[PDB]
């Protein structure tokens, strides 16, 4: 057509605006911060599907980049990684039921595949091995957070956001 | 027992561009009387709203309300119990609500203040009837409702735990006249029931016809605090500090200017009907 | 609640798609090379640009501050690349060398010069200009498989509704707090489950504006992206040559010294 | 002659769902160059009317259905051409706003029609100038009062030069001063270009100044025509779900204590001069 249209598309614009705002704030306790940008990433997955999802994350990094820093930039490639997160949330969750097998396998991979490999690949811009050790230095979060994330994602998604999807 | 002791407020403090919401507010309010709040837009009246439930704290002075006292220092420690007394339903309360049903959403308020399940169940229906809608839809989900019902259940969820002081900003801002004189009736019926009511609306028709206290505001400054008479009577004054006469006061003043001077103090229409028999008398 | 832009009153900060493209060009110029003198020419040029603006230095610290730990962690750990290197003694393998610690000054200047031009961009210009700047970077790829009408449109809408979603967020925060919502507090679960009352009413308010905006859009005659005109229209004026000077003058000599 | 009519027809949303959402048979019409209010309780179907006329929504008969606006039958095709004779100012500007500056928003429809920019500039200047928004013309939506946001809404549609301006509760939550001005704006606008303003409002005091009003309740119209004859419907009109205006309640609250009632008589200066006469 191409797929979607206005009112499908104006919605896509309002749910990226969420994840540039979300990814700004962190909650968090004295014990651990676990910043919440991730809800934005998972929403783009199960609603708009995998392939619009990839288009969501890529744009959400460009959007934040104007009103915020990008902590650097541009890269380009930071945006590439911001993209791939929502996409593989699209798989396991789109045209797919609500199930415990779909959510957790998705959370664990986001950290390891895209978050690790790509973050392990971008400040790279040099040789790889100096890079792995800076991130190897940073791993604990990727051990703890994904697990609180699966609990959190179940409480949002099955947690009346998806049940309130309809209607309307 | 509302008291504001030299209380100002400044936005973005310790930062450049500090806009001032409130400048040296000094005043005290009657316990259990209808207190209207009015001004031009961007007066800072909505700031003042979240001041005495202590969502914001003063950057100067003292606020004594509900037997508490709110300093610039006062922390976030015991504000829980401050809010069972004072309550806000913000301009759009329809957007305030959630979960799977109407009943569990209103009891959410009392539940957060430690009501028993039984207590919260009965307290739920107790105020879901009081807001006059409805037997069957009490168990319905909150999201399929009309704008009349959506801004009811919200206003129930705020009233369900029975706040002693209740302050609502523009609660009728979107309703129809059947709604207004419905919703404005409950505010006045809760009032003589022994509870304070702050109400902030541009509408000057129900400010004169209902409210006892009115306190105007301009550029963060408190310009007048009085009965809706003292402030309303001076015509060109209301121009200078931008406000407006109610519907009665407008037409009477005009018929008076070329015409007869009745003994009012016009306020509400019943008194107007009194004022225009005396015309021939 | 804006960020960052102490862009007030001084000269330049002009022609964003020129400026943006430059910072994109400077990034990849650093990325390229090399052992010596190449790192000298790009570092001096990068420094030339930042006080050409006349910007208060204090703002540059704001961007490197979170990364400072990350800099000196990789820098010295690069040195201690187990052998590794390189030229001198003092001492082991496994330890410092005159060659080992120069490489660790290079990761410092690259990380700096990234976060200099990245800063110099994100500050001196304004968001709606930058949006029209990276609309230009998208311009060439149109006739590849991507409709640029849509990925230009959603950005435009997103940006405009980012603050007005933020304010309706805090309105929901305070509206719930006033009703006895307490957060974060709690621990783990419920800390957490207390986040949903700020989420779903934020979600459903998004639909209300989604419908309303799409409704109000179509009614004003929005058929599609194809076949419009444009109001905004950025222009190159005479200063344009200065970023092309930087671009072509630095990087012909930087490429010769590259190898 | 007459600008717009809705013949026998019915409508539903979202699509045909359960119980029976609809307006009704309706059987409704309005004259060229006349301000006409449309009133009913919340959920009486006042929004649909505006979107029906607009073309965004379609009726559920399509054989019986005829909605013709200045000589076009609506109905699938031709919808963008009927969409150019009408324009709509929705309540709550924030969501209805699109574009960076205000001079950006009000030329939107203009670039929808592929108007060259050299012309676009001139029109848009005059547009914001017309609505008094002149030197706020580089400002972004967030800075503007919801009142003056709804001035930018006006200049938006005023730009494409429509023959019918619908106001959908546009004035709803504004200042008293701000609600005063916006109508006096569109009322100024009306005489200038000779247009038709379909107002929709819950405010009954500004419905009194309509040329023709019409009431809509639960599905359908009950009474319609000149405000003079519609407002006297008294008791029933109260139970109907809406209410009395002030002058008419003044009539009512006078008579309640016995005082005389010469009627209709719907104005201000016409009252005030009549007041001299009754004093005698
Ligand atoms: N977050 C903020 N930061 C800085 N200044 C603010 C902020 N919010 C509001 N203000 C200022 O404080 C005032 C807000 O007044 P306020 O009473 O909230 O608006 P209002 O329209 O008059 N009342 P209401 O319609 O009920 O919201 C204005 O002068 C604003 O410029
Ligand atoms: N998907 C839908 N789209 C539009 N209207 C709907 C939809 N579903 C139900 N409706 C009904 O459409 C009716 C339109 O009435 P409406 O005109 O909104 O009255 P209102 O309360 O005064 N709001 P408005 O006049 O639009 O400012 C409402 O009663 C809704 O129940």
Coordinates of N, CA, C and O in Angstrom, one line a residue, chain C residues 46-200:
Chain C
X46 N 40.0 20.3 15.2 CA 38.8 20.2 16.1 C 38.8 21.2 17.2 O 37.8 21.7 17.6
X47 N 40.0 21.5 17.7 CA 40.2 22.6 18.7 C 40.0 24.0 18.1 O 39.5 24.9 18.8
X48 N 40.4 24.1 16.9 CA 40.1 25.4 16.2 C 38.7 25.7 16.1 O 38.3 26.9 16.2
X49 N 37.8 24.7 15.8 CA 36.4 24.9 15.6 C 35.7 25.3 16.9 O 34.7 26.1 16.9
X50 N 36.1 24.8 18.0 CA 35.3 24.9 19.3 C 35.5 26.3 19.9 O 34.5 26.8 20.5
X51 N 36.6 26.9 19.7 CA 36.7 28.3 20.2 C 36.5 29.3 19.1 O 36.5 30.5 19.3
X52 N 36.3 28.8 17.8 CA 35.8 29.6 16.7 C 34.4 30.0 17.0 O 33.9 31.1 16.7
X53 N 33.6 29.1 17.7 CA 32.3 29.4 18.2 C 32.4 30.5 19.3 O 31.6 31.4 19.3
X54 N 33.4 30.3 20.2 CA 33.5 31.2 21.3 C 32.7 30.7 22.5 O 32.3 31.5 23.3
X55 N 32.5 29.4 22.5 CA 31.6 28.8 23.5 C 32.3 28.6 24.9 O 33.5 28.3 24.9
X56 N 31.6 28.9 26.0 CA 32.0 28.6 27.3 C 32.4 27.1 27.4 O 31.6 26.2 27.1
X57 N 33.7 26.9 27.8 CA 34.2 25.5 27.9 C 33.5 24.6 28.8 O 33.4 23.4 28.5
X58 N 32.9 25.2 29.9 CA 32.2 24.4 30.9 C 31.1 23.4 30.4 O 30.9 22.4 31.0
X59 N 30.5 23.8 29.2 CA 29.5 22.9 28.6 C 30.0 21.6 28.1 O 29.3 20.6 28.0
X60 N 31.3 21.6 27.6 CA 31.9 20.4 27.1 C 32.1 19.3 28.1 O 32.1 18.1 27.8
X61 N 32.3 19.7 29.4 CA 32.4 18.8 30.5 C 31.1 18.0 30.7 O 31.2 16.8 31.1
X62 N 30.0 18.6 30.3 CA 28.7 18.0 30.6 C 28.6 16.7 29.7 O 27.9 15.8 30.2
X63 N 29.2 16.7 28.6 CA 29.1 15.5 27.7 C 30.1 14.4 28.0 O 29.8 13.2 27.8
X64 N 31.3 14.8 28.4 CA 32.3 13.8 28.7 C 32.3 13.2 30.1 O 32.8 12.2 30.4
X65 N 31.5 13.9 31.0 CA 31.5 13.5 32.4 C 31.0 12.1 32.6 O 31.7 11.3 33.4
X66 N 30.0 11.6 32.0 CA 29.6 10.2 32.1 C 30.7 9.3 31.5 O 30.9 8.1 32.0
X67 N 31.3 9.7 30.5 CA 32.3 8.9 29.7 C 33.7 8.9 30.3 O 34.5 8.1 30.0
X68 N 34.0 9.9 31.2 CA 35.4 10.0 31.8 C 35.9 8.7 32.3 O 37.0 8.3 32.0
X69 N 35.1 8.0 33.1 CA 35.4 6.7 33.6 C 35.7 5.7 32.5 O 36.7 5.0 32.5
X70 N 34.9 5.8 31.4 CA 35.0 4.9 30.3 C 36.3 5.2 29.5 O 36.9 4.3 28.9
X71 N 36.7 6.5 29.4 CA 37.9 6.9 28.7 C 39.1 6.2 29.4 O 39.8 5.4 28.8
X72 N 39.4 6.6 30.6 CA 40.7 6.2 31.3 C 40.7 4.8 31.7 O 41.7 4.2 32.0
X73 N 39.5 4.1 31.6 CA 39.4 2.7 31.8 C 40.0 1.9 30.6 O 40.8 1.0 30.8
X74 N 39.5 2.3 29.4 CA 40.0 1.6 28.2 C 41.4 2.1 27.9 O 42.2 1.2 27.4
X75 N 41.7 3.4 28.0 CA 43.0 3.9 27.7 C 44.2 3.2 28.3 O 45.1 2.7 27.7
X76 N 44.1 3.1 29.7 CA 45.2 2.5 30.4 C 45.2 1.0 30.2 O 46.2 0.3 30.3
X77 N 44.0 0.4 30.0 CA 43.8 -1.0 29.9 C 44.3 -1.4 28.5 O 44.6 -2.6 28.2
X78 N 44.3 -0.5 27.5 CA 44.8 -0.7 26.2 C 46.3 -0.8 26.3 O 46.9 -1.6 25.6
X79 N 46.9 0.1 27.1 CA 48.3 0.0 27.3 C 48.8 -1.3 27.9 O 49.8 -1.9 27.4
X80 N 48.1 -1.8 28.9 CA 48.3 -3.1 29.5 C 47.7 -4.2 28.8 O 47.5 -5.3 29.4
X81 N 47.5 -4.0 27.5 CA 47.2 -5.1 26.6 C 48.4 -6.1 26.9 O 49.6 -5.7 26.7
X82 N 48.1 -7.3 27.3 CA 49.1 -8.3 27.7 C 49.9 -8.5 26.4 O 49.2 -8.4 25.3
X83 N 51.2 -8.7 26.4 CA 52.0 -8.3 25.3 C 51.4 -8.8 23.9 O 51.3 -10.0 23.7
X84 N 51.1 -7.8 23.1 CA 51.1 -6.5 23.6 C 52.4 -5.7 23.4 O 53.2 -6.1 22.6
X85 N 52.5 -4.5 24.0 CA 53.6 -3.6 23.7 C 54.2 -2.6 24.6 O 53.8 -2.4 25.7
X86 N 55.1 -1.8 24.0 CA 55.8 -2.2 22.8 C 57.3 -1.9 22.7 O 58.1 -2.8 22.8
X87 N 57.6 -0.6 22.5 CA 59.0 -0.3 22.1 C 60.0 -0.3 23.3 O 61.2 -0.8 23.1
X88 N 59.7 0.3 24.4 CA 60.6 0.4 25.5 C 60.5 -0.7 26.5 O 59.7 -1.6 26.4
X89 N 61.4 -0.6 27.5 CA 61.4 -1.4 28.7 C 60.4 -0.8 29.6 O 59.5 -0.1 29.2
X90 N 60.6 -1.1 30.9 CA 59.8 -0.5 32.0 C 58.3 -0.7 32.0 O 57.5 0.2 31.7
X91 N 57.9 -2.0 32.2 CA 58.8 -3.1 32.4 C 58.5 -4.4 31.7 O 59.1 -4.7 30.7
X92 N 57.4 -5.1 32.2 CA 57.3 -6.5 31.8 C 56.8 -6.7 30.4 O 57.5 -6.8 29.4
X93 N 55.5 -6.7 30.4 CA 54.8 -7.3 29.2 C 53.5 -6.6 28.8 O 53.5 -6.1 27.6
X94 N 52.4 -6.5 29.5 CA 52.1 -6.7 31.0 C 52.4 -5.4 31.7 O 52.0 -5.2 32.9
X95 N 53.1 -4.5 31.1 CA 53.4 -3.2 31.7 C 53.7 -2.1 30.7 O 53.7 -2.3 29.5
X96 N 53.9 -0.9 31.2 CA 54.1 0.3 30.4 C 55.2 0.2 29.4 O 56.2 -0.5 29.6
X97 N 55.0 0.9 28.3 CA 56.1 1.2 27.3 C 55.9 2.5 26.7 O 54.7 3.0 26.7
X98 N 56.9 3.1 26.1 CA 56.8 4.4 25.5 C 55.8 4.3 24.3 O 55.2 5.3 23.9
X99 N 55.8 3.1 23.6 CA 54.8 2.9 22.6 C 53.4 2.5 23.1 O 52.4 2.9 22.5
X100 N 53.4 1.8 24.2 CA 52.1 1.4 24.8 C 51.3 2.5 25.3 O 50.0 2.5 25.1
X101 N 51.9 3.5 25.9 CA 51.1 4.6 26.4 C 50.9 5.8 25.5 O 50.1 6.7 25.8
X102 N 51.4 5.7 24.3 CA 51.0 6.7 23.3 C 49.7 6.4 22.7 O 48.9 7.2 22.4
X103 N 49.5 5.1 22.4 CA 48.2 4.5 21.9 C 47.1 4.9 22.9 O 46.0 5.1 22.4
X104 N 47.4 5.0 24.1 CA 46.5 5.4 25.2 C 46.2 6.8 25.3 O 45.3 7.3 26.0
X105 N 47.0 7.6 24.5 CA 46.7 9.1 24.4 C 45.8 9.3 23.1 O 45.2 10.4 23.0
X106 N 45.8 8.3 22.2 CA 45.1 8.4 21.0 C 43.6 8.2 21.2 O 42.7 8.8 20.6
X107 N 43.3 7.2 22.0 CA 41.9 6.9 22.3 C 41.3 8.0 23.1 O 40.1 8.2 23.1
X108 N 42.2 8.8 23.8 CA 41.7 10.0 24.5 C 41.3 11.1 23.6 O 40.3 11.8 23.8
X109 N 42.1 11.3 22.6 CA 41.9 12.5 21.7 C 40.7 12.1 20.7 O 39.9 13.0 20.4
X110 N 40.6 10.9 20.3 CA 39.5 10.4 19.5 C 38.2 10.5 20.2 O 37.2 11.0 19.7
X111 N 38.2 10.0 21.5 CA 37.0 10.1 22.3 C 36.6 11.5 22.6 O 35.5 11.9 22.7
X112 N 37.7 12.4 22.7 CA 37.4 13.8 22.9 C 36.9 14.4 21.7 O 35.8 15.1 21.7
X113 N 37.5 14.2 20.5 CA 37.1 14.9 19.3 C 35.8 14.4 18.8 O 35.1 15.1 18.0
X114 N 35.4 13.2 19.1 CA 34.1 12.7 18.9 C 33.1 13.6 19.7 O 32.1 14.1 19.2
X115 N 33.4 13.7 21.0 CA 32.5 14.4 22.0 C 32.7 15.9 21.9 O 32.0 16.6 22.6
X116 N 33.6 16.4 21.0 CA 33.7 17.8 20.8 C 32.7 18.2 19.7 O 31.8 18.9 19.9
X117 N 32.9 17.6 18.5 CA 32.0 17.9 17.3 C 30.6 17.4 17.6 O 29.6 18.1 17.1
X118 N 30.4 16.3 18.3 CA 29.1 15.9 18.8 C 28.4 16.9 19.6 O 27.2 17.2 19.5
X119 N 29.2 17.6 20.5 CA 28.7 18.6 21.3 C 28.5 19.9 20.5 O 27.4 20.5 20.6
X120 N 29.5 20.3 19.8 CA 29.4 21.5 18.9 C 28.2 21.5 18.0 O 27.6 22.6 17.7
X121 N 27.8 20.3 17.6 CA 26.5 20.2 16.8 C 25.3 20.4 17.7 O 24.5 21.3 17.6
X122 N 25.2 19.5 18.7 CA 24.0 19.4 19.6 C 23.7 20.6 20.4 O 22.6 20.8 20.9
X123 N 24.6 21.6 20.4 CA 24.4 22.8 21.1 C 24.1 24.0 20.2 O 23.0 24.5 20.3
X124 N 25.1 24.3 19.3 CA 25.0 25.6 18.5 C 23.7 25.7 17.7 O 23.3 26.8 17.4
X125 N 23.0 24.6 17.4 CA 21.8 24.7 16.5 C 20.6 24.3 17.3 O 20.6 24.0 18.5
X126 N 19.4 24.4 16.6 CA 18.1 24.2 17.2 C 17.5 23.0 16.6 O 17.6 22.7 15.4
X127 N 16.7 22.3 17.4 CA 16.1 21.0 17.1 C 15.3 20.9 15.8 O 15.5 20.0 15.0
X128 N 14.5 21.9 15.5 CA 13.7 21.9 14.3 C 14.5 22.1 13.1 O 14.2 21.7 12.0
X129 N 15.7 22.8 13.3 CA 16.7 22.9 12.2 C 17.4 21.6 12.0 O 17.6 21.2 10.8
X130 N 17.8 21.0 13.1 CA 18.5 19.7 13.0 C 17.7 18.7 12.3 O 18.2 17.8 11.6
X131 N 16.4 18.7 12.6 CA 15.4 17.8 11.9 C 15.4 18.0 10.4 O 15.2 17.1 9.7
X132 N 15.5 19.3 10.0 CA 15.6 19.6 8.6 C 17.0 19.4 8.1 O 17.3 19.4 6.9
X133 N 18.0 19.3 9.0 CA 19.3 18.9 8.6 C 19.5 17.5 8.2 O 20.1 17.1 7.2
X134 N 18.9 16.6 9.1 CA 19.0 15.1 8.8 C 17.9 14.7 8.0 O 17.7 13.5 7.7
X135 N 17.0 15.6 7.5 CA 16.1 15.3 6.5 C 16.9 15.3 5.2 O 16.6 14.6 4.2
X136 N 17.9 16.2 5.1 CA 18.8 16.3 4.0 C 19.7 15.1 3.8 O 20.0 14.7 2.7
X137 N 20.2 14.6 4.9 CA 21.0 13.4 4.9 C 20.2 12.2 4.4 O 20.8 11.3 3.8
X138 N 18.9 12.3 4.6 CA 18.0 11.2 4.0 C 17.6 11.4 2.6 O 17.3 10.5 1.9
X139 N 17.7 12.7 2.1 CA 17.3 13.0 0.7 C 17.9 12.1 -0.4 O 17.1 11.7 -1.3
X140 N 19.2 11.7 -0.4 CA 19.7 10.9 -1.5 C 19.0 9.5 -1.6 O 18.9 9.0 -2.7
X141 N 18.7 8.9 -0.5 CA 18.3 7.4 -0.4 C 16.9 7.2 -0.8 O 16.4 6.0 -0.8
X142 N 16.2 8.2 -1.2 CA 14.7 8.2 -1.5 C 14.4 7.1 -2.5 O 13.4 6.3 -2.3
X143 N 15.1 7.0 -3.6 CA 14.7 6.1 -4.7 C 15.2 4.7 -4.5 O 14.9 3.8 -5.3
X144 N 15.9 4.5 -3.4 CA 16.0 3.1 -2.8 C 14.6 2.8 -2.2 O 13.7 3.6 -2.3
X145 N 14.5 1.8 -1.4 CA 13.2 1.2 -1.1 C 12.4 1.9 -0.1 O 11.3 1.5 0.3
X146 N 12.9 3.1 0.4 CA 12.3 3.8 1.5 C 11.5 5.0 1.1 O 12.1 5.9 0.5
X147 N 10.3 5.1 1.5 CA 9.4 6.2 1.3 C 9.9 7.3 2.3 O 9.7 7.1 3.5
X148 N 10.3 8.4 1.8 CA 10.9 9.5 2.7 C 9.8 10.4 3.3 O 10.0 11.1 4.3
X149 N 8.6 10.3 2.6 CA 7.5 11.1 3.1 C 7.1 10.7 4.5 O 6.8 11.5 5.4
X150 N 7.1 9.4 4.8 CA 6.6 8.8 6.0 C 7.7 8.9 7.1 O 7.3 9.3 8.3
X151 N 8.9 8.7 6.8 CA 10.0 8.7 7.8 C 10.4 10.2 8.1 O 11.2 10.4 9.0
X152 N 10.0 11.1 7.2 CA 10.1 12.5 7.5 C 8.9 13.0 8.4 O 9.0 13.8 9.2
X153 N 7.7 12.4 8.1 CA 6.5 12.9 8.7 C 6.4 12.5 10.2 O 6.1 13.3 11.1
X154 N 6.7 11.2 10.5 CA 6.7 10.7 11.8 C 7.6 11.4 12.8 O 7.3 11.7 13.9
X155 N 8.8 11.7 12.3 CA 9.8 12.5 13.0 C 9.2 13.9 13.4 O 9.2 14.2 14.6
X156 N 8.7 14.6 12.4 CA 8.0 15.9 12.6 C 6.9 15.8 13.7 O 6.9 16.6 14.6
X157 N 6.1 14.8 13.6 CA 5.0 14.6 14.6 C 5.6 14.3 16.0 O 5.2 14.9 17.0
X158 N 6.4 13.3 16.0 CA 7.1 12.8 17.2 C 7.7 14.0 18.0 O 7.3 14.2 19.2
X159 N 8.6 14.7 17.4 CA 9.3 15.9 18.0 C 8.3 16.9 18.7 O 8.4 17.2 19.8
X160 N 7.2 17.2 17.9 CA 6.2 18.2 18.4 C 5.5 17.7 19.6 O 5.1 18.4 20.5
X161 N 5.2 16.4 19.7 CA 4.5 15.8 20.7 C 5.3 15.1 21.8 O 4.8 14.5 22.7
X162 N 6.6 15.3 21.8 CA 7.5 14.8 22.9 C 7.3 15.6 24.2 O 7.1 15.0 25.2
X163 N 7.3 17.0 24.1 CA 7.1 17.7 25.4 C 5.7 17.6 25.9 O 5.5 17.4 27.1
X164 N 4.7 17.6 25.0 CA 3.3 17.6 25.3 C 2.9 16.2 25.8 O 1.8 16.1 26.4
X165 N 3.7 15.2 25.5 CA 3.6 13.9 26.2 C 4.3 13.9 27.6 O 3.8 13.2 28.5
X166 N 5.4 14.6 27.7 CA 6.1 14.7 28.9 C 5.3 15.4 30.0 O 5.2 15.0 31.2
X167 N 4.6 16.5 29.6 CA 3.8 17.3 30.5 C 2.5 16.5 31.0 O 2.1 16.6 32.1
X168 N 1.9 15.8 30.0 CA 0.8 15.0 30.4 C 1.2 13.7 31.2 O 0.4 13.1 31.8
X169 N 2.5 13.4 31.2 CA 3.1 12.4 32.0 C 3.1 12.8 33.5 O 2.6 12.1 34.4
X170 N 3.7 14.0 33.7 CA 3.8 14.5 35.1 C 2.5 14.9 35.6 O 2.3 14.9 36.8
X171 N 1.5 15.3 34.7 CA 0.2 15.6 35.2 C -0.5 14.3 35.7 O -1.2 14.3 36.7
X172 N -0.2 13.2 35.1 CA -0.7 11.9 35.5 C 0.0 11.5 36.8 O -0.6 10.9 37.7
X173 N 1.3 11.7 36.8 CA 2.1 11.5 38.1 C 1.5 12.1 39.2 O 1.0 11.5 40.2
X174 N 1.4 13.4 39.2 CA 0.8 14.2 40.3 C -0.7 13.9 40.5 O -1.2 14.0 41.6
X175 N -1.4 13.6 39.4 CA -2.9 13.3 39.6 C -3.0 12.0 40.4 O -4.0 11.8 41.1
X176 N -2.1 11.1 40.1 CA -2.2 9.8 40.9 C -1.6 10.0 42.3 O -2.2 9.4 43.2
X177 N -0.5 10.7 42.4 CA 0.1 11.0 43.7 C -1.0 11.6 44.7 O -1.1 11.2 45.8
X178 N -1.7 12.6 44.2 CA -2.8 13.2 44.9 C -3.9 12.2 45.4 O -4.6 12.5 46.4
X179 N -4.0 11.1 44.6 CA -5.0 10.1 45.0 C -4.4 9.0 45.9 O -5.1 8.1 46.2
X180 N -3.2 9.2 46.3 CA -2.5 8.3 47.2 C -1.5 7.4 46.6 O -1.0 6.5 47.3
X181 N -1.2 7.6 45.3 CA -0.2 6.8 44.7 C 1.1 7.2 45.3 O 1.5 8.4 45.4
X182 N 1.9 6.2 45.7 CA 3.2 6.5 46.3 C 4.3 5.7 45.5 O 4.2 4.5 45.4
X183 N 5.2 6.5 44.9 CA 6.3 5.9 44.1 C 7.5 6.8 44.1 O 7.4 8.0 44.3
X184 N 8.7 6.2 43.9 CA 8.9 4.8 43.7 C 8.7 3.9 44.9 O 7.8 3.0 44.9
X185 N 9.4 4.2 46.0 CA 9.3 3.5 47.3 C 9.3 2.0 47.1 O 10.0 1.5 46.2
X186 N 8.5 1.3 47.9 CA 8.3 -0.1 47.6 C 9.6 -1.0 47.6 O 10.7 -0.5 47.9
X187 N 9.5 -2.2 47.1 CA 10.7 -2.9 46.6 C 10.4 -3.9 45.6 O 9.4 -4.6 45.7
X188 N 11.3 -4.0 44.6 CA 11.1 -4.9 43.4 C 9.7 -4.8 43.0 O 9.2 -3.8 42.6
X189 N 8.9 -6.0 43.0 CA 7.5 -6.0 42.6 C 6.8 -5.0 43.4 O 7.0 -4.8 44.6
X190 N 5.8 -4.3 42.7 CA 5.0 -3.2 43.3 C 5.7 -1.8 43.2 O 5.1 -0.8 43.4
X191 N 7.0 -1.9 42.8 CA 7.7 -0.6 42.6 C 7.7 0.2 41.3 O 7.5 1.4 41.4
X192 N 7.8 -0.3 40.1 CA 7.3 -1.6 39.4 C 5.8 -1.6 39.3 O 5.3 -0.7 38.6
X193 N 5.0 -2.5 39.8 CA 3.6 -2.6 39.5 C 2.9 -1.2 39.7 O 1.8 -1.0 39.2
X194 N 3.6 -0.3 40.5 CA 3.1 1.0 40.7 C 3.4 1.9 39.5 O 3.0 3.1 39.5
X195 N 4.2 1.4 38.5 CA 4.4 2.2 37.3 C 3.3 2.2 36.3 O 3.1 3.1 35.5
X196 N 2.5 1.1 36.3 CA 1.4 1.0 35.4 C 0.3 2.2 35.5 O -0.2 2.6 34.4
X197 N 0.0 2.7 36.7 CA -1.0 3.8 36.7 C -0.5 5.0 36.0 O -1.3 5.9 35.8
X198 N 0.8 5.2 35.8 CA 1.3 6.3 35.0 C 1.4 6.0 33.5 O 1.6 6.8 32.7
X199 N 1.3 4.7 33.2 CA 1.6 4.2 31.8 C 0.3 4.1 31.0 O 0.1 4.8 30.0
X200 N -0.6 3.3 31.4 CA -1.9 3.1 30.6 C -2.7 4.3 30.4 O -3.3 4.5 29.4

